[PDB]
Structure formats: structure tokens, C-alpha cells
A paper describes a structure:
We find that colicin E1 binds stably to TolC, not as a helical hairpin but as a single-pass folded helix with the N-terminus inside the periplasm. When resolved by cryoEM, addition of ColE1-T to TolC breaks the threefold channel symmetry and the additional protein is observed running all the way through the TolC barrel as a single-pass, all-α-helical chain spanning more than 130 Å. The ColE1 T domain inserts into TolC with its amino terminus pointing inwards through the periplasmic iris, and 2D class averages show that the carboxy terminus of the helix continues and projects out into the extracellular space. The ColE1 chain binds TolC asymmetrically, primarily contacting only one of the three TolC chains. However, our cryoEM reconstruction of colicin E1 in complex with TolC shows that ColE1-T hinges open at the TolC box to an extended conformation upon binding to TolC (bottom). Compared to the unbound state, asymmetric ColE1 binding dilates the periplasmic TolC aperture and, makes only minor adjustments to the loops on the extracellular aperture so that they can accommodate ColE1 in the absence of any other proteins or motive force. The acidic patch of colicin E1 near the extracellular aperture contains two arginine residues (R129 and R131) that form hydrogen bond networks with one TolC chain each. In addition, colicin E1 residues T113, A116, N119, and N120 (all part of the TolC box) establish polar interactions with TolC residues G67, D69, S90, and K305 on one TolC chain (light red and light blue) while colicin H117 interacts with TolC F310 on a neighboring TolC chain (light red and light gold).
Colicin E1 is a bacteriocin produced by, and lethal to, Escherichia coli that hijacks the outer membrane proteins (OMPs) TolC and BtuB to enter the cell. Colicin E1 is a bacteriocin produced by E. coli that enters the periplasm of neighboring cells and forms a pore on the cytoplasmic membrane leading to membrane depolarization and cell death. Unlike any of the other E colicins, the T domain of Colicin E1 binds to TolC, the outer membrane component of the acridine efflux pump, and the R domain binds BtuB, the primary receptor shared by all E colicins. TolC forms a large rigid conduit in the outer membrane and periplasm with a water-filled lumen.
Residue numbers in the entry:
A (entry chain D): 46 to 131
B (entry chain B), C (entry chain C), D (entry chain A): 23 to 450
Write the structure that this text describes.
Amino acid sequence: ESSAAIHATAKWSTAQLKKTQAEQAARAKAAAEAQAKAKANRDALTQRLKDIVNEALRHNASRTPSATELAHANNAAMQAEDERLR
Amino acid sequence: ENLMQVYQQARLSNPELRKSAADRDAAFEKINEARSPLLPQLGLGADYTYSNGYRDANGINSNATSASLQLTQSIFDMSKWRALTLQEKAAGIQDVTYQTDQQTLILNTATAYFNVLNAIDVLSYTQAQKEAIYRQLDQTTQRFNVGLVAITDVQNARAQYDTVLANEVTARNNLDNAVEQLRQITGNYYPELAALNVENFKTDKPQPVNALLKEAEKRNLSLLQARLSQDLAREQIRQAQDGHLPTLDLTASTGISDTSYSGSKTRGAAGTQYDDSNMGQNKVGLSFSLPIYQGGMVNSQVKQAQYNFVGASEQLESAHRSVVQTVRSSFNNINASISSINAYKQAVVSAQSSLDAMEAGYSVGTRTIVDVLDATTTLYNAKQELANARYNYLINQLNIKSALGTLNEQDLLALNNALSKPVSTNPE
Amino acid sequence: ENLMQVYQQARLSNPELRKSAADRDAAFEKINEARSPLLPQLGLGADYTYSNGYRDANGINSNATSASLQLTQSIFDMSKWRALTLQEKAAGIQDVTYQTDQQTLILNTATAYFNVLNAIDVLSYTQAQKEAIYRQLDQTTQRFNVGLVAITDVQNARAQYDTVLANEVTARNNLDNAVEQLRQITGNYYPELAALNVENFKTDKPQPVNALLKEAEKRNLSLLQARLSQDLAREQIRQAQDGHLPTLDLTASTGISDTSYSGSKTRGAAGTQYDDSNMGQNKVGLSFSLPIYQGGMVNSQVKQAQYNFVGASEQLESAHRSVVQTVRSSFNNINASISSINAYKQAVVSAQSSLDAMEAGYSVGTRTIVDVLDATTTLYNAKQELANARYNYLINQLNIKSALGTLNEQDLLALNNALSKPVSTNPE
Amino acid sequence: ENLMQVYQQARLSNPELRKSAADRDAAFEKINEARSPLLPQLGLGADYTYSNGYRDANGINSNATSASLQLTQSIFDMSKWRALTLQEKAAGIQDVTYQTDQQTLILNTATAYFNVLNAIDVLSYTQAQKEAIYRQLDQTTQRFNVGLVAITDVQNARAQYDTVLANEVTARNNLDNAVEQLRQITGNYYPELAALNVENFKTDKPQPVNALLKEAEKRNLSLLQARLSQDLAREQIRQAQDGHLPTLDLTASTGISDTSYSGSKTRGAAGTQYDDSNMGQNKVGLSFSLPIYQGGMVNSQVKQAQYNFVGASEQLESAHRSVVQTVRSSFNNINASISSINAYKQAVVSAQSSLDAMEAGYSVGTRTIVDVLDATTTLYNAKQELANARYNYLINQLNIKSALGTLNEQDLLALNNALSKPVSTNPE
């Protein structure tokens, strides 16, 4: 009976479509998750390279006195030389 | 709009790209902050002081004030030069970050555009399937009322029609969500998009995967960023090691100072010595420093920097394995989408050649018209699979170019030439 | 318990929210640390020193010791006022973060509660489907033993029963795991939950999307946090710009010292220069500072702060687009859940009408057992879709209140009013 | 290779674990940096200056120089002992982080290996289903050439066969992409893997969930890391509180200097104030400091540390709920995979018994080829789910060992005992 081939093909075809839709949804979800992880990793790297240099500049800014601290030390040293002659 | 026109509106307005451009420009501006400690520093400092002596110093009060300009510049300080070269490398890593955020906007714009077209097609096939099932349901209902057909075929046709109505609501909601994803990327809503030219559409074969691997190893942005990150980790070994070096600074100043005295011990003849005093000084000085030993600190910092560089060199192997897998899986997916388009094209043509014979002979009287209803499902299943396979080929054809790192506006132009007639994003 | 009682336990119990409350309280207490540099700074120093002169000063020895109570108070330094007002803004940003964690605990508690109820219903329909298929396996086995049907009908019913048995094991595992997600949120196991009153349940149409958007854009916590983050980035420009300004501090001190001398050059008539001393000193003084030039450092810091504010203004556009898409998708998903509930409500009745006709069709021999098993499985599938659609409507009915930023326990009370009969989380 | 041999190549080469090992060893070398400020600091300073007086200091000029080797040693500074102790605790937290990466490489290697074996079986069953569907296309073509059936039956057989070809393409693509993911973990392509010995495969019942959970509570690495993180936050309270304590440093210096004077005012009877000098100073001293009031700063820091410890103690409760849910869900999924293996093993024999009846019925000609097709497609669906369930059981047997925190290579040896004959990763 020809109808039995039509019924079998209709039912089996619809199962292959539903399988393909489930695969397509899983494929889209996995790609979106991988992109979100990669974006978060680039943001973390962006903060790391910023903090590496900010810490190196903070260290260089504290390896020595500042121009203000040296001006205040000189202001004291003028008075210390006056008090040597006093 | 077509895909190219949609991409121009995205490129001009998209905040993900425009934030990344601002975060890049800030890193290039920080090169001047990192340069600045090598240049002449200049400041004014000034003071006033009252003082009152007691306990042996009793009966001496004093009033003093002074000011000076102070110049400073490093003559030799490699730790400052390393802070500059690290910022030049950090800005380079940030530019490759911006190139990656720029390149991914292209892929996301095309993905959103083809998701809207795919949702329009899935809705259109669901509506075409519904109307075909409804025509068969109606004809079965007439044949039942004439007494030619048993009510069980009308009940089955109602179950088919009622479940396809729930599928149309689902397909409609998928389209009405997809256009808002396109709005979020592009900043705009579109009443109609240029559809895929399926009447002329054809698939090209990719390059052999050995050529794709050799190309990606030259130009992939994630691998390039990993190479630059390894070099920044290597420069941090030198920035640690240079902590052992001597340091030399030039300083220069012009200062002025005044002082007076008061109180009982400064009165009378003692006021000859505790007289008012005035001073100015110009001076120049070279200050030198050399750390001889620091509890082993710099030797630990060098070993930490060496382990950080080992970590960065393994992170480059991680990046290399990742791009190798990405071009190979993209090459597989292009060959799979090409061969499955060819399979589903023949499945649609044979299902159409079936349905064109079924809808004649089984309407005329060969067997129940529920066989035309079942034959209809095979065709609209196959048309949905074929349409979805075409959009998978188009998306993978951009995806492989993102894996090469070459993906740019000329690839959107190449895909935009595969579009033609406009279709509305909002059916009646 | 009902949904309200589950939430009133979760609100008190949940560590994720209580951790967020601790981070909020820490960010507010840190305002006082940010205030401290504007208040008096006060400490005691003390010293002791031996000294031995060698070359020229050869054989002048001395010993000195001192103590000094010291005070400092800043009179003008805008960087400390910026640091305070930036911490007050950072605390405000942490409070809207805590409000978002408080609001998302409600949505997670409701989502877990409805996932358990949905799993109880999926298991219940799977057991009912298994028993209906078992009744047909028994009836066809009897008909086969009487000789009314071939053994192939029993083989079809048996294979269909054995595959639905494997689905019941799967449905039971989905329920058993869903209850552990509810335990992870609430801290508690529950033997029974109040089920949805499907006899009295009815859907309500949402407000028009323009009114939802107009309310969300003035209440959504993610958008509010982005506005506060842009305002913080604007204050960071002022923090950079104020780096050009002068600075003025007040200082005060009360010192005491002792000093004594020894060695060959301090004996005899020369000893009158040395002797000993006991000086006390009060001091009060102002110290002024003005950076004149710093290699362009502050100009780079200002331009970096401006690019950071541009990045924050694009972060606000990103938040605004995200709210628009979240409100529009939630409004569409509500309308889709309402219309699909009314589709499946009909599809269950026509599937049941089809099954009643199909078992009659098999009894008169115009259908096969496989048609009855398909009519059975399509009916129990339509029941599972209808039940699932009600829970998706209830979750989306909270999701739009989350998109509006208004979601609170009064919405849980409104949903809890639709619950009635207790059903066990752990059936026999 | 078998799974044990694959894991040797993974453990030797894998960049994720090797990068984690470098990040662990860096944190242990940082203990030597954290200890270094407690040890003697030693530095050579040197100086040269020219000076030129003006305004009553007019006609006084000077050249001066110094060299000074100087030493510092803390006698009491509790903040340094706290900073060392915090780095030893941070290194301990990093060691259990590395131990978690070492453990998760095992689970990832086994998961990737079983994904390849599962894809080989899915492809093999898809090719068996293709071989069965081809018999319909053959029979309809022969019967059409005999003139016994219409062209419609060939067109539907072609539409079905061209669709199972699209499924073979999909299965083959999934096998290729599984092998690329295994090659990312392991660094290697394998032509052959050792397959599961399904003829001697044996399900085994887990320990009771109370015994599993009582072991996991002593042993789980994420819970141990949360306990160590709470203890670090508790040490940070002591590190904040000890900011109220006094400080005491020793220092020493072997200083040398030279000085001379020039200009008109340096000459004549006042020249005793302006004579040449060569003085050295060999000195040793103690320096004490005690903050008395700091605008409440240390009390804000102590309360911030107390809120941080409250936050860390709620992270420990969150970790405890996470391992409870992970152990219970692993125990559920072992019992469910064991039960569903038994269910699908019966379903395969049941569907095989149905197919053996249809195949005999088709061979004598009382049944149709589409009866055999329906029996074969349902059988290979059952065989595919039985294979899928076996690999899920084997993965869940590692997942409970991961939840216990005991997972190590002896669990891969226990799996490797169930592996046997080599199968090609890339068939004909």
C-alpha cells in the first residue's frame, strides 16, 4: 500500500527536522558562550596591562623624592645653614 | 536595507566597538604619562614657621619663612625607561584588542541579519504548511459531510491544523525576537531586508586546510595578541633585572630664606647674635644611589617574572592549539554545509516531485487526501532544512575568515552580492 | 510550603545575597577611610643615636636622643575631597548592585520553584502515558491469545512500552535533580510544594510596550548603575584636572631632646663647644606646594580620564539598548505564552477527540495499533506542552517586572495566590 | 592509543595545566619577596653639589661631596610579619587551585576521549540506518521497472534516502570535530582509539549518598579552597588591627664627606665659618614611631576587614551548598544512568525481536519493506541511546570522584580496564 511509505516518510522526516533544530540551538548556544568567555578574557587582559604599567609608574614615583619634597627639604636646608652660622 | 547598508549603520553607532575605540585611545595617551618621569620635573615649595624654645632652649622664640623652585631630571634610571617600553607594548596589545572587537562586530552583524532572514523563511514555510493542511482539512470536511469519508480523518486533520497553529505562534515569536537582536547590534529597526537570492545561489569550495593553517599562523588576531603578551612578559624579566642597577639624578634649585628671633634670652647683648637673618641660594647637585643588598627581593622578583614568562609562553601554546582547532573545525563545517545543501536540494526536488503527483491523484480519488497532508509535511520539513543549511554555509564562510583574522568589510560586500529582493520583517 | 513561604526562607538563608550585603556595608564603611586624610593626623616619634667622628672630625664622639609629639591638618588639597566624594559615589554604585542581587534572588527562587512543579507534571504525564500504553499492551496480548490479532501488534505495543519505561526513568531523574537546585538556593529540602491551580488559572494581557519602555528607562537597576558609572567617570575627570592645583597643609610639633659628647677632641678647653644640651622646641608652621611642570603628566591623565568618560558614556548606551531589547523580548514572550496556552488548550481537546476516534477505528479494524499509540503519545505530549506553557507564562510575568526593575515580594504574593494543592517532590 | 596512553600525552603537554603550574610556582617564589623586608636592607648613597649664595649670602660659594654606605633592619614591625603570613596563605590557596586544574584535566581528557568513541558509534548506526533505508529505494525502483508500483513510491524513497545522506554528512562532521577537540586537549592526532568492551561492560552501584557527602565534606578541593579563603580573610582582620601598634627600626651609616668654599665673603676673619673639611661619621641609631590618632582610618580598615570576613564566611556557605548539590546530583545521575542502561538494553532486545519478525515477514512477502524500515529505524534509535547511556555512566563515575575531590589517574586505569579493540577515528 503506497500510503504506508507516505506515512513513514512524513513521521521520520519530522523527527529529522526536530533533531536538526535541537542541534542548531546547541550550536548557537555554544558559539555565544565561547564569544562571551573570549570577550571577558580580553577585558581581563585590558585591566591587567593597565595595572602592570600603573604599578611600574607608582614604583618609579616612590623610588625617589618628588620635586615638592626636594623643595621643602631645600627650604629646611637653608634654615639649617643659617642655624650653623647662628 | 541590505547587509552592507545595515553594517554601515552598525559601524557608525555600535557602543561595543565605540567603547573599545575609547579604551584603545586611552592606552595610546598613557604613553605620554609613561614618558613624563624621564622629562624635567619642576615645582615650587614654600614654608612659614613660628617656634618657641623651652628646657635649656628657654627664652628663645623665632619666626622664619622660605621658598624655592626645584628642578629634577634622571640622568640614568632604567626603571623609568622600562615603564615607557612596557606602555608602548601594552598599547600594541590594546590595538589588537580593538582590531578583534572591530572584526567581531562584522561577524555579529551578519549573524543577526541572517537570523532575521532565517526566521522569516521558517515562518513563511510554517504558514505555507498551515494553508496546505487547512485546504486538506476543509476538503476532508466536505467529503465527510457528503458521507464519502469517516469522521476519524476530520479529527486527524483537526489535530494536524491545531498543532501547526501553535507552531506558527512559535515561529512568529522567534521572528519578533530576532529583529530586536538586530536592533541591539545596529541601533535601528528595519521594516524590510534584502533576502538571499536562492534563484541564483551557489557554493564555492574553501582553500585546502594546510593553506588556511599557514595563513592563520601569519594573521590570526588572537595568536598575534598571545605573541605580543609573551613579549610583554619577557620585557617584565628585564624590568625586574634592572632593579639591581645604579641610579643617577640631576637636581637644581633657586631658594630664598628669612628669619627673626624674640624672647628673654635673645634680649640685650645677645640680640647682636640673635639678629635678623636673610639668605638666597642657587645650587646644582648630582644624587647617586646603588642598592647593595635588599633581603634577596630583586632575585625573587626576577624568578617571579621568569615564571610569569613561562606562563605566557604556555598561554601562547594554548592560543596556537585554539586557532588550529578553529580553522580545522571551520573547514569541516564549510565542507559539511556544502555537501548537506546538495543533499537537501535533492530531497526538496524529490519531495516536490512527489507532492505535485500526490496533490493531483489523491485529490482526484486514488486514496484519502490525508496522504497529500502527510506528503506536504515532508516538503516543508525539507525546505526548512535546506534554507537553514544555506544560512549555515554563509555564516561559516565568514567564520573561517575570522579564524584567518582576515575578515573585513569586503567580505560583507561579497555576501551582499548574494542578496536580491526585499522581504518585510513584519508580515500581516 | 508555597512559593511565598519558600522565598521567606530563601531571603533569610541565601549566602549569595548575604555576601552582597557584606560587600555593600564594606563600601559604605570605606567612606570613613576616604574621609580620614581630611581630619587631624597625630603621632609620636622617638629616636636614639650614637655617633663616632673619623677623619678630620677624628675623635669627636656623641650620643643624642629625642621625642616629638606631632600633628598635621590639610588646609587646602582638592585631591582628598575628590577621593572622599568618589568613595561616596562608589558606595552608591555598590548599593544598586546589592538591589540587583536582592531582586535576582526573587527571580531565581521563583524559577527553581516552577522548575520543580514543571518536573512533577512531566513525570506525572509520563507515568499516565506509560499506564495507557501498558493497558493497550495487555489488551492486545489478550486479543492475540484469543486469535483476533497477529503477534506483530503485541511486538509493537511491547517496543513502545519498553521505550516509554526508559523515558519515565529520565523524567524521574529530572525531578530528583530539580529539587537539589531548589535546595542550593533556599538551603532546605521540601517534601511537598503548593501546585498551580489550573482550574482557576487565567492569563492577563501586559501593558503596551511603549508604557513598559517609558517606565523601565526610569527604574531599571542596570541602566541606573550605568548612569551612576558615567557620573563617577565624569568625577574622575575633575580628580585628574585638580592635579594642577596648589596645596597647603598646617603642621605642629612639641619636641624634647638630649645630647652629650665624648672622645679626645671633646676634652679640655675645646669641651666648651660641646658640653651637653637639653633643648625643648614648640613649632607651628604652614607648608605650601605648587607643581609648575611634570613632563605633561597631568595633561595625559586628564585626556585618559576624558577617554574613560567617553567609554563610560558608550557603556550607558550599551545598557540602554540592553534594556530596550530585554523589555521588548519580554513583552513579545508574554504575548506568545498567552496565545500558545490558548493554542495548546484546543490541541489537547482535538488530540483527545482523535484518540477516542482512533481506539474505535482500531476496534473496527480500520486503524492499526501504531495509530492508537501515536494518538496516545500526541495527546500526552499536548498535555506536557500546555502545562509547560503555563509555567513559562508565570516566569515571564516576573521577568517583565525584572526588566522594569520593580520586581519585589508583592509580585511573589500575586503569583502565590494562584497556587493551592500540595504535591510531593518525591512520589512513590 | 587507549585512554591511559592518551592521558600520558595530555598530562605531559597540556598548556592549561602547565600555565597553572607556572602561576603556582610564582606564588611560592613570592614568599621570598614577602620575607625580604624583614631582612637587612643595605644601600650605597653618593652626592656632589655646587652652591652659590646671593642676598646677604652673596660672595659665599661652596663645593661639597659625600659617600654613605647605610643599613636598615626592623626590630619590631608586625605589619611585615602579617604580610609574610598572608603570602604563605595565598601560596596555599594557589596550590589547591593548581590541584583543581590538575584534577579537571583528567575529567576533560576522559570526556573528549568518550566524545570521539560516541561519535564513531553514532556514525556507525547512521550508516546502518542508511543501508536499511536504501532497501526501500531499491525495492521501489525494481517494482517500478516491473510496472507494479507508481513513480510516487520511488520519489518518496529518494526523498527519505537523500535525507539520511544529509544525516550521514552531519554524523561524519560531528566525528571530525570531536577528533579536533581531543587533539586540542592532548596535542596529538590519533588514527585509532581503544573501544569500550560492551560484551563484558558492567554497571556497579555507587556508595550511599550520606557516605559520599561525608567524604566530600572532608576532601572536596573547592570547599577546601573556600575554608582557606575564610582563614585568609580572618588573618586580614589581624593585619588591619595590628595597624594600631608601634614600630621600631635599627639603622647604621658609614658616612664620608668633603667640602670647600670660594668667593670674596669666604675670605678674611670670618673664614673660620668657611674653612675646608673632610669629616667622616660612623653612626648607629634606633627610631621609634606610634600613631595616636588618624581620623579613624585604622578603625574603618578593621571594620572593612570584618565585613570582608563575613563575605568570605558566606562564600564558604555557598561552596558548602554547591558541593552538597554536586554530590547529590552526581549520585542521582549514576543511579539514573545505571537504570536507563538496563531500560535501553531491554528496549534494544525488544526492538530486535520486532525487527526479526518484520524481516522474516518481508522475506516471505506478507510484510512490506516500510514495516522493516520502521522496525529498523526504531531499533537503531534504541542502540544509539544504549551506547549514549554507557558513555554517560562512565563519565558520571569520574564526576562523583570529582565531587569527592579524589579523582586521579587510578580512576582512568579503572576505565582503561573496560577498553579493548582499536577502532579508526576516520573510517572509509
